[PDB]
Design a protein around this ligand. Structure first.
Ligand SMILES: O=C(O)CCC(=O)C(=O)O
Ligand SMILES: [Fe+3]
Lengths: 429, 18
């Protein structure tokens, strides 16, 4: 290689090299000071400014400090404001700025930086691809879709753009349309396409249209390290946790919780029925595109280890009962919720995002016929007042063909083999 | 949106730096 030195910078290369050598040798504090001195003496030097930013970046890593990193992010921008900045340096500085803004969770800031990059380098397709990711990270699928449509208009066979366009189409329930983009994108082998998210959604789109090739893609995704197995396809995992579709209470160790749910199941049922009868708007329809058809709604008391205070006003005894069990109330990768499903419902085969939880189901109102749940290769039914336990990281599927409603209580627990240290440090999902 | 029950979002965790 990159050309990072402007005319003046070539005249001070000896000083610039001396400072960078300190950085490369790990003398970060000395390197910071060396580049700070260069920025003082040569305030317009783009290479000196970039060196200062790189040292602040390394220092932020050394001190694990977001504030130090915020300084680097500003200095990376200062490089771009200086006169006569070489094109290669301008791109490197603003790209790293955007990347570090994303690390900090400053997604709107990264977006503005990525927008500037595309304006400065209009023919760089990689930068537009990066802008699309910026929109995806903030949840703006509509603008991300338009970015990848622009990329595919000029480079139709860009595989990064194909898989991401396919991902967006799938999210919008354009299943058939998404398959060729996801498939051709993965097959391109372009950098960024060998990603478990695209294998996950290609196979799922294929399953939804009845394409039996789905599991060849799950097999390949497993062989390439994205899935623990063809059946267990979660992407936010702690490696090595016991992997089994169905669990007994004793196997989980959470026997006191299970005893409490089964001994007190009728109070849990009754509060759920009262909400159905007098506060039915607390049941929210499932909103993750997991239904082929039918009506399925959830009343959530806990999510991400956080109690919903207003919801617990609707099930106060159930919330009081459950507060004695932090193995569920503190499961920041699970929920506690009522789940109602009505006749004519089919839930698509799907997997949850993480192997770090197990999912308990307490039967509350179970019709005598028509309701069942498959996990992996094994299908079961619910019983009123009894707990079933499965690992939702394994593919599972549900049918409701009874002649009345089916109500269960879903209680997520931390995987029993996760230590307290792990349970405290895993990011919430 | 949150990845409550599937993997429908591009990312399922929040970004908070160090
Ligand atoms: O049967 C239900 O209400 C939900 C089934 C399910 O997909 C799950 O519990 O993860
Ligand atoms: Fe599920």
């Amino acid at each position: 290689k990159p050309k990072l030195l402007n005319k003046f910078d070539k005249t001070i290369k000896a000083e610039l090299d001396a400072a960078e050598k300190l950085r490369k040798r790990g003398k970060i504090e000395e390197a910071v000071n060396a580049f700070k001195e260069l920025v003082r003496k040569y305030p317009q030097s783009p290479r000196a400014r970039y060196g200062k930013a790189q040292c602040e970046d390394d220092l932020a890593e050394k001190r694990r400090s977001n504030e130090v990193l915020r300084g680097a992010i500003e200095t990376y921008q200062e490089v771009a404001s200086l006169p006569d900045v070489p094109a290669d340096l301008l791109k490197l500085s603003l790209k790293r700025r955007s990347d570090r803004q994303q690390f900090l969770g400053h997604m709107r800031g990264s977006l503005l930086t990525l927008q500037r990059l595309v304006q400065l380098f209009p023919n760089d397709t990689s930068l537009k691809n990066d802008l699309g990711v910026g929109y995806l990270l903030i949840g703006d699928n509509d603008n991300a879709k338009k970015v990848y449509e622009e990329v595919l208009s000029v480079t139709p066979n860009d595989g990064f753009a194909k898989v991401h366009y396919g991902f967006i189409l799938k999210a919008q329930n354009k299943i058939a349309e998404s398959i060729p983009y996801l498939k051709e994108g993965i097959e391109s082998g372009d950098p960024g396409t060998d990603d478990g998210r695209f294998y996950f959604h290609l196979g799922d789109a294929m399953q939804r249209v009845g394409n039996k090739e789905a599991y060849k893609w799950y097999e390949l995704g497993h062989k390439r390290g994205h899935f623990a197995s063809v059946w267990q396809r979660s992407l936010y995992n702690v490696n090595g946790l016991k992997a089994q579709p169905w669990w007994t209470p004793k196997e989980t160790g959470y026997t006191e919780l299970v005893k409490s749910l089964e001994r007190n199941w009728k109070l849990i049922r009754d509060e759920g029925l009262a909400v159905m009868d007098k506060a039915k708007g607390l049941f929210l329809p499932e909103d993750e595109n997991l239904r082929e058809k039918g009506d399925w709604s959830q009343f959530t008391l806990w999510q991400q280890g956080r109690r919903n205070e207003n919801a617990c006003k609707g099930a106060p005894k159930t919330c009081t009962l459950l507060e004695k069990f932090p193995e569920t109330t503190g499961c920041r990768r699970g929920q506690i919720k009522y789940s109602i499903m009505h006749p004519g419902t089919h839930v698509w085969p799907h997997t949850g995002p993480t192997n770090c939880r197990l999912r308990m189901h307490l039967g509350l109102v179970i019709p005598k016929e028509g309701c069942k749940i498959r996990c992996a290769n094994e299908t079961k039914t619910w019983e009123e007042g009894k707990v079933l336990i499965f690992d939702d990281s394994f593919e599972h599927e549900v049918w409701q063909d009874a002649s009345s409603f089916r109500l269960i209580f879903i209680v997520d627990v931390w995987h029993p083999e996760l230590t307290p240290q792990q349970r405290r440090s895993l990011p919430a999902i | 949106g949150k990845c409550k029950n599937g993997l429908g979002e591009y990312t399922c965790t929040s970004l908070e730096g160090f």
